[PDB]
């Protein structure tokens, strides 16, 4: 329907992008998805202003369903598609877009429009946001963080959605990666937006991890260089560090992955067991600066950030295999512990028999059941950090009030052994 | 009642067994047994005919017990009892009969008459087949297989019962592996038998490796030497290459072995810590042919097995110690999570403080209380292959029928890694 | 408002303790506790007569709260306070008063008065008796297992609450550890005692382990030592033993352990890293009679004990942090697999992301609400010793009242392997 978008005019961010608010609409178009053909349910293409990973003030785009029933009181549905190509031409909008002539159409079409026809067949407003944005950044978590949230406010200004509308999230492999930094930043980025839940699995929290994990012993190693050009592609003084130290080999390596028509697929199995050390001069490179900071900034996980990691309190479904071959299990787990321990509202859910195929499938139809008891405001109490679903009593129902805020109330002072009450 | 089956004409494969198709009965006869006189239940000893481990074609007799008010619509439960003997007269049928005399007699009398009892008071029709068969072979699936299907198929044929009669299996310990191995084989077996589920733990899924944890090195000993002679019983060219490399000693204890009145309580107690591999000359036997070939066929653990391994659909019930001191849990675990990932239908149990003795009756009412919703079709929605049973919800609840339907089309497609969704 | 106890008199055994029976009344006073204002309850201290480590006849007190709308039929709970000291003005008697001038304030002020508040509306008679005994011996079991006992006996007598009333129990650390030795003692001591629920997590079961656990590499290292002491002062003949090894540090702990205002507080801060050895000359001493004999009898746990430790048969609930860092995990777990191989009905509840001051209040809300189930007789049927609630069912119903008759009878007999049948 629409062009290539390194050709597309809508892909670009006007001179003016400053006096556009973050996550207010810049412009619209119609827009034919597979999607909203198949719900009966319009379709549009929202230019948006957000902003990026150095707090210049740019631009990005997300396509939005409207559903031809709708939902009272409103709620939103925030699909977060798994791109992981450093190409703008992979971006979700594009690809959505009914037609065979785009190639990144793989991402869109496996379990994707399931979960958004769920989504608008409940009734609920639908948006996907290019989170990777014009740059197209990869496994950078702030740019994709403000990106999705803002496309959440645009999706609200758009259609003059009530201020507190329920707003939900879905997300797989790097949609959850998405998903994940939309929450953690959720807090003080966008803070106007009442965030009812977040349902993702397969989260790679921390980034160098899921690095070193693909790096030099996975058929999908070429992850292993689509994530360090995303970062560099969102961190231009880490180009400025890797670009010289490139050799031969490295340069067209890092041309190949981030050309035109490189998306997941060819991504995946293009660089089968790549050492992406071996492309560069200095394999000590994860050491220095400004890539050592860059890394301990672009992490969930506690542990190593060089920064505070926030802890939602909303009502989060999370999920991973444990025999994970792309996305380690290590670091997720970690990230959901750690939450846990400063009170988060986890549950979570690990599959034995799991392949990181196999658990997209297995945690689709448990997280979109999970959605939607909390977009009725009755996700159930279990308990937090268990693999397994536990069942925990409500404090209101066993205490009576008086006890339970009594009891709530425990969190941060000291017990008798000078050690302090955490968050319960 | 009757005499020694030894003895018995009625425990013969008649002249003209190739006239007779696999499941059709040759002759019965009445039998007083316990367990029919406990529930007022008629019983009788069906000869009928069944097909063996070389396809040359067999008999066997199974007990069955006829409820004196039947359920309707009809359905049929077949007790996989544990003879763990290689003896005619340690098998199941003469044992049930009334009377104090026979040597196999604790194997009917401690939980099974229970199992069976329970299914007789819920008005259904009850056969326990003598699954090693007139050759007693102990630990050979096959045979084992064979036989206990075409006692359901006899069973339904001597009282006319519908085709898609519904039809649940219990069976622990040996009984499990009869019961484990009729599941295999019911594919392509007996495809014709409405197969409502099957319900058995503490399954020695591998042959090799229930021998390895038994040999040598426990007090029950006994177990891989009577499973050696199963095998060599339905398998006679392991027969002949064992017999000339038998020392006297170990001609001794293989003849004991065999001898009248050996049963399973015999057996276990007869042979502590006895290592087989002292009894016969040369101590690499198993990996020489045609024994090492006949293992790798006898084995359920498709990591093993020298054939491609069935995976059942239909709803599974399972259990087992982890602190198992005769059925090694390692196997089992390990035939559970492959069959789960190839999309079977397994209920995982696994138990924490647990004994073989112990977990025999453990899992007994669970089991029994886990088959009666499987009757009713409703056999629980659970997350399978996890150690505890977790309620996942239903596709055509959570997506509606045509989203469930276009959910269910992803399995063995591709996702956009390259690698193939599997059955989930 | 009442004086320090070792200068009141209430806090004297009378001469003729003899006259009176096990958890008799010797005398009792009003106490205005802050409990008891906030909930509308009068309140009283009992001076009562008990036993003691040596079955020489002695009394501790217990204080009492009376429901101003009281249930019908009578209800008992019974919260155990976490005294943690060997001091005198810690009990909890003294600290339950309304007022700020006593030193171990504390323990009766952060989760316990949640417990207790809970009990009293929902119209229990509540009793916490000060289990460590005139003595205040701390981590001695068999005192305190006697004194919590008989403080539910004198409260029964204070009233004249009928004697099948329903007596239910929390306690959480050192508060667990007397409630788990008023447990193993129930059988014996009180048979008069219709205990129908036991709450409580985080179990010291091992003296012996405890103090090696926070002995010398903890900063909890007071409880290794105020955990001898405790033992020193109920076993005079430790006492004798310990007294002469003293150095010159080792008196000015011991002295100050066990001074006024030393209390839990003081103890778990005020001794971090302390070697108990290094205080003691003979490091082999805990090794040396009479302290290894003490030991066997004070560890709960059956494969250290030199007794046959109880296995009560009343619902129990119990938990524990697995990354427990003062009270260790191992010991309760050990000690729960064995009481659940012998046939208890022990629910346990493990909780991953853990503290020991977080699984306080982890565990604190659903205990109340599972005891609020066992008074009304209803705990739930689950399995028995495994880290999370599977809902087992019931055998009667599932088998039918004859067969659960026959189940029940297979416990205690063979089965055919012939190890015996446990109780299940
Ligand atoms: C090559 O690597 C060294 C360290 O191994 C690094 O200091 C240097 O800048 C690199 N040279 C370039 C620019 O290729
Ligand atoms: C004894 O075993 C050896 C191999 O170790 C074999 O060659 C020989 O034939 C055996 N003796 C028999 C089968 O009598
Ligand atoms: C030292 O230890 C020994 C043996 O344990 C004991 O007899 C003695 O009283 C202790 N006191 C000193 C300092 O001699």
């Given at each position: 329907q629409?062009?290539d978008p390194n050709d ?10 400053n ?36 707090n ?14 709708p ?13 992981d ?28 429009p399931?979960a958004?026809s769920w ?12 989170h990777?944005?014009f740059?197209?950044?990869f ?59 977040a349902?993702?699995?397969?989260l ?18 070429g992850f ?11 961190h ?6 890797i670009?010289?130290?490139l ?6 390596v ?7 028509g490189?998306?997941?697929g ?5 660089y ?31 542990s ?12 989060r479904?999370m999920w ?12 997720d ?13 986890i ?7 799991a ?21 009725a405001?009755q ?21 009576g ?8 109330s425990?969190?941060?002072q ?5 050690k ?5």
């Open positions: 629409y062009p597309d005019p809508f892909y670009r961010v006007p001179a003016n992008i006096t556009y608010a973050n996550g207010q609409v810049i412009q619209s178009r119609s827009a034919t998805t597979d999607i909203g053909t198949q719900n009966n349910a319009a379709s549009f293409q929202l230019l948006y202003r957000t902003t990026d990973t150095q210049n003030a740019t631009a990005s785009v997300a396509t939005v369903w409207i559903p031809s029933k939902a009272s009181p409103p709620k939103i549905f925030s699909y977060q598609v798994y791109e190509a450093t190409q703008l031409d992979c971006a979700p909008s594009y690809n959505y877009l009914s037609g065979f002539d785009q190639p990144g159409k793989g991402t869109v079409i496996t379990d994707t399931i958004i989504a608008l067949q409940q009734g609920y407003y639908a948006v996907s946001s290019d990777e944005g740059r197209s950044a496994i950078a978590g702030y740019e994709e963080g403000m990106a999705i949230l803002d496309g959440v406010r645009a999706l609200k200004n758009y259609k003059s959605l009530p201020s507190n509308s329920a707003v939900g999230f879905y997300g797989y492999s790097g949609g959850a990666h998405a998903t994940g930094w939309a929450v953690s930043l959720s807090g003080a980025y966008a803070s106007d937006l009442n965030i009812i839940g349902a993702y699995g397969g790679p929290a921390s980034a160098k991890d899921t690095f070193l994990f693909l790096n030099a012993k996975s058929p999908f190693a292993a260089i689509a994530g360090v050009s995303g970062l560099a592609l969102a231009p003084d880490m180009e400025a560090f670009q010289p130290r050799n031969a080999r490295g340069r067209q890092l041309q190949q992955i981030r050309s035109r490189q998306c997941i060819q991504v995946s199995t293009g089968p067991f790549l050492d992406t050390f071996s492309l560069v001069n200095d394999t000590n490179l994860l050491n220095e600066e400004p890539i050592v900071s860059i890394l301990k900034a672009e992490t969930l996980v506690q190593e950030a060089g920064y505070t990691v926030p802890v939602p309190k909303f009502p479904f991973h295999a444990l025999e994970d071959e792309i996305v380690p299990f290590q670091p787990a970690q990230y959901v512990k750690e939450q846990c321990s400063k009170g988060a509202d549950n979570w859910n690990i599959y034995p028999v392949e990181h195929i196999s658990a997209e499938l297995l945690g689709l139809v448990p997280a979109l059941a999970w959605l939607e008891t909390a977009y405001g996700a159930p109490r279990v308990l937090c950090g268990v693999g397994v679903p536990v069942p925990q009593p409500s404090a209101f129902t066993v205490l009030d008086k006890l339970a805020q009594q009891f709530k425990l969190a941060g000291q017990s008798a052994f000078g302090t009450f955490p968050s319960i």
